[PDB]
Amino acid sequence: NTDTLERVTEIFKALGDYNRIRIMELLSVSEASVGHISHQLNLSQSNVSHQLKLLKSVHLVKAKRQGQSMIYSLDDIHVATMLKQAIHHANHP
Amino acid sequence: NTDTLERVTEIFKALGDYNRIRIMELLSVSEASVGHISHQLNLSQSNVSHQLKLLKSVHLVKAKRQGQSMIYSLDDIHVATMLKQAIHHANHPK
Secondary structure, three states: HHHHHHHHHHHHHHHOOHHHHHHHHHHHOOOOOOHHHHHHOOOOOHHHHHHHHHHHHHOOEEEEEOEEEEEEOOOOOOHHHHHHHHHHHHHHH | OOHHHHHHHHHHHOOOOOOHHHHHHHHHOOOOHHHHHHHOOOOOOOHHHHHHHHHHHOEEEEEEOOOEEEEEEOOOHHHHHHHHHHHHHHHOOO
16 A cells, blocks of 8 residues: 555665665674674775665664664564565575 | 675665556465556556566566466565565554
8 A cells, every 4th residue: 555665665775785785684694783794794884874874764774772882683574584585586496 | 695695686676666566566466467467556558568577587577378368476485475574564563
């Protein structure tokens, strides 16, 4: 239905990007700080943060304080499941 | 790896479109001909076909002959599962 379908359109527009997919995949491995995301993907912290704010605005990632820095994670199991199944499909026959 | 992530990048670019999402969701209800897709979504057959060729080129939909017409379906369960879980998330709390 109309509004559900505009949110899923926004979800998939946000996922349509090589570096945002790399960040999603990394988060699917484990929750992570900006600095760890930047180190592993060889992306600047400023770029990482920019892409996380975009992912967070369509509710694909969340952020939770843990003392001094912000830990990012895939929002929930539905986002994780969507992502893993897409990757698996991409990997295969 | 690199080429896996380019294919999934392609998958997600293809899905990033209101009318292509409408078409995927309908297919997730049932496999269908172009004329049925057109009628249900009030899209021209020439537009539906165009979108299905793009969806097929990144392996999100497939086509199989059934007598004289061509029947489209989501490619496999992983595509169905990706879609249904994304819909559910958009439909939901938090």
